[PDB]
Amino acid sequence: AVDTAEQVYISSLALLKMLKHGRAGVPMEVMGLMLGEFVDDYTVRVIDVFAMPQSGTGVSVEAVDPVFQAKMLDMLKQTGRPEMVVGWYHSHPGFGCWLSGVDINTQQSFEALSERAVAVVVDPIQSVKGKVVIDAFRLINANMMVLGHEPRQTTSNLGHLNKPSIQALIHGLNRHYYSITINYRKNELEQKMLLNLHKKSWMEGLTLQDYSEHCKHNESVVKEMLELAKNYNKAVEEEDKMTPEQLAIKNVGKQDPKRHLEEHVDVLMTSNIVQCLAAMLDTVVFK
Amino acid sequence: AVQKVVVHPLVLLSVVDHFNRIGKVGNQKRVVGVLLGSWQKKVLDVSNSFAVPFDEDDKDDSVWFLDHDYLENMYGMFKKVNARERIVGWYHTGPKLHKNDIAINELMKRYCPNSVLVIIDVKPKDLGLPTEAYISVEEVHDDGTPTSKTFEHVTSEIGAEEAEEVGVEHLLRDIKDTTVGTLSQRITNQVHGLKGLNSKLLDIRSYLEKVATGKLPINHQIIYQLQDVFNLLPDVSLQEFVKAFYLKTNDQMVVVYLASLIRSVVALHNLINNKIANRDAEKKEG
Amino acid sequence: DVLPPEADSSIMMLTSDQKPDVMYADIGGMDIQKQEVREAVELPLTHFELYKQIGIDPPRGVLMYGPPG
Amino acid sequence: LQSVGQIVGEVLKQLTEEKFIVKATNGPRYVVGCRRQLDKSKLKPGTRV
């Protein structure tokens, strides 16, 4: 039967497409279908995804609409892309990762058409600067459980590396469906292309800024430096006149110059040094 | 007309995988697609794009084939999922602009009177941006033609949206800047500037070498701009400039002096605090 | 998280349709109360240095009482 | 029979582009987001949402 070592491989474009589509329609549950292939019965590759038109005034859309799907499938082939659909996906904004009651019936159709599909759930607003929340599930039947047998026969220990969250356990999960591991395929070309973000032209690194605002900024900084200097010794003197057990709590409402002056020093040194060096080499690069 | 164009990484990834999937089949050289985006003031934004069947012959640069119905129905189909997007222009992955670009631009200027051409390099080898942006215009001069169609460059840059930003941050696990400070302020700005300036001077060297020995189509606007460049170099031997330079440098160093003094004082205070607090810990063990 | 200051109820009397265009000239005859209110309200707001230097401890608030009208 | 109601409240101010703070008819006040397609120029303090 099925095993716990099943793997799914998601490209970068598919991830970014589905993330953007899910983030666009935040208040409701948008949906779409994937496409890829089954190279074997341990790993399933998905290579491209596409969104589908929805019926508004709700948070759920039935997937049965053959005209659009058929047209997209027969039109993508004209420019490559001979792949077939492998499953569907939809987004849960700020909830987690699970399958609602109607979702079992929704995925039942794909199971009937092909017994080895998969459902992907992405969380668009709980992910920040990494750790994108994406899960993949497949359904099970209760008659086989009546036989006193459990699905997903285990042959190795690489299938139990992540413990499920408590909210997944609260809903159906293991008594109604099983999750599978996920992986991202990375190659050198797209990764090398993608690191060009926020790179600046060669012009931005040779401008030496105006020589009028710089002195104003230095003058502004020096005065607060002076005031913090005046306030330092007051806190230095009374550092031990009070028991140290409440020393930390004494600094809960008012600022302390010691921490609040180092940032001034750092920014000031950095600005002055870089402004000097830029003009230093520019005096000889040009004539 | 147009001041700046902003390009999201999504269209870059789409260009890359379209090129891969269509070049795997056979030995094609150039591929074409159409972009979607938005306008605001004089700033253009590009969001996504889709491909289109295109054919071109290497025998002659006057024969080529595009599909109209494909473009029309595909735009109509993307309309039903998001109505904010609209046709803005097209892209071709050629390493350098070709002769047929004017003809294709005229062909698909029907769908957008302000079409903008974008060139994306699929295998860059330098630190420069992979994208270049052009717009058509009519130029006039003394003799030859009252008007002639000519491309003009427009500033381009790579932008990012929140979801796109978190996606690309998740994808770039291996490479990340070491420090943020004088390091990133120096190497990412100055050395790269020297690199780019040297590359530009080398290219103009090459063009000037091509003249007065080889082909020799003497062009005069380039000469005028070269004279303007060579006339604008300042003089650094003037006495007043030297005096002002010295005055400003001497004015600037005092601040670094003061900051170093403050850092030394803070370090001494920290040392005193640690020593005093830690010397009172050995006797508690008995 | 900590949060920036926020309020409710009456906000600012935002000066567009809030200045009630009633001048001091339209009021006539109560110069004593006018002077008392001026000294007890407006002067501490501007000339606080004189109040500190003479040492007269400006009042925190005032009360008005009398027959209606 | 495939629709649900929505709670009613009053807006107070907006912290940033995507964050508002709103008060329901009852006491509790929340820091909430907004729909993407909705216009943001009509949400002056005091309106009902």
Instruction: Give the number of other Cβ atoms within 10 Å of residue C64's Cβ.
Output: 6
Do B233 and B133 belong to one domain? Answer: no
Do B107 and B234 belong to one domain? Answer: no
Do B92 and B230 belong to one domain? Answer: no
CA of A45: how far to CAs of A5, A48, B278, in Å? 15, 10, 59
The amino acid present at A83, given as its one-letter code, is E
Nearest to A213 by CA among A259, A275, A171, A164: A275
Q: Give dist(CA A21, CA A89) in Å, integer.
A: 11
- Partners of residue A50 on adjacent β-strands: A33
Residue B209 within any structural domain of the chain: no
Do B149 and B82 belong to one domain? Answer: yes
Do B58 and B140 belong to one domain? Answer: yes
Residue B215 within any structural domain of the chain: no
Give the gyration radius of chain A's Cα atoms. Answer: 29
Q: Which residues contact B73 (CB under 8 A, 6 or more apart)?
A: A75
Method of structure determination: cryo-EM
- Partners of residue B48 on adjacent β-strands: B36
Classified as helix, coil or strand, C9 is coil
DSSP classification of residue A246: G
Residue B245 within any structural domain of the chain: yes
| Contact residues, chain A, for D36 at CB < 8 Å | 24-26
Do B103 and B154 belong to one domain? Answer: yes
Q: What domain count does chain B have? A: 2
Strands B43-51 and D29-32: unpaired
Are B and A touching by the rule of 3+ CB pairs within 8 Å? yes
Tokens of B81: 């999922």
The minimum CA-CA distance between B45 and chain A, rounded to whole Å, is 15
Element (H, E) at B36: strand B32-40
Domain termination residue (choose one: B182, B210, B232): B182
Query: Is D46 in contact with D11 (CB distance < 8 Å)?
Result: yes
Classified as helix, coil or strand, A76 is helix
Q: What is the 3-state secondary structure (H, E, C) of chain B?
A: CCCEEEECHHHHHHHHHHHHHHHCCCCCCCCEEEEEEEEECCEEEEEEEEECCEEECCCCCCCEEECHHHHHHHHHHHHCCCCCCEEEEEEECCCCCCCCHHHHHHHHCCCCCCCEEEEECCCCCCCCCCEEEEEEEEECCCCCCCCEEEEEEEEEEECCCHHHHHHHHHHCCCCCCCCCCHHHHHHHHHHHHHHHHHHHHHHHHHHHHHCCCCCCCCCHHHHHHHHHHHHCCCCCCCHHHHHHHHHHHHHHHHHHHHHHHHHHHHHHHHHHHHHHHHHCCCHHHC
Residue B125 within any structural domain of the chain: yes
Tokens of C19: 């200045």
Domain of B59, in residue numbers: 2-182
Which string of DSSP letters, residue by residue, matches A15-33?
HHHHHHHHHHTTTS--EEE
Residue B104 within any structural domain of the chain: yes
Do B58 and B128 belong to one domain? Answer: yes
Do B258 and B161 belong to one domain? Answer: no
Nearest to B128 by CA among A281, A190, A193: A193
Q: Give dist(CA A83, CA A73) in Å, integer.
A: 9
CA of B152: how far to CAs of B42, B76, B110, B149, B258, in Å? 16, 31, 20, 10, 51
Outline where DSSP puts E strands in chain C.
none
The minimum CA-CA distance between C11 and chain D, rounded to whole Å, is 10
| Contact residues, chain D, for A25 at CB < 8 Å | 36
Q: Which residues contact B80 (CB under 8 A, 6 or more apart)?
A: A53, A68
Do B59 and B113 belong to one domain? Answer: yes
Q: Give dist(CA B10, CA B168) in Å, integer.
A: 10
The amino acid present at C36, given as its one-letter code, is E
Query: Is B127 in contact with B195 (CB distance < 8 Å)?
Result: yes
Size of interface A-B (CB pairs under 8 A): 179
Contact B81 A269 (CB under 8 A): no
Do B135 and B261 belong to one domain? Answer: no
Residue B19 within any structural domain of the chain: yes
Mutation target vs A (from D2, D7, D18; most A CBs, 10 A cutoff) = D2
Instruction: Give the number of other Cβ atoms within 10 Å of residue A129's Cβ.
Output: 9
Query: Is A275 in contact with B265 (CB distance < 8 Å)?
Result: no
Do B32 and B103 belong to one domain? Answer: yes
Residue B39 within any structural domain of the chain: yes
Buried b (16+ CB within 10 A) or exposed e, B41-57: eeebbbbbbbbbebebe
Domain termination residue (choose one: B182, B214, B246): B182
Do B14 and B129 belong to one domain? Answer: yes
Classified as helix, coil or strand, A215 is helix
The minimum CA-CA distance between D2 and chain A, rounded to whole Å, is 8
B153 half-sphere exposure, CB direction, 13 A CA radius: 7
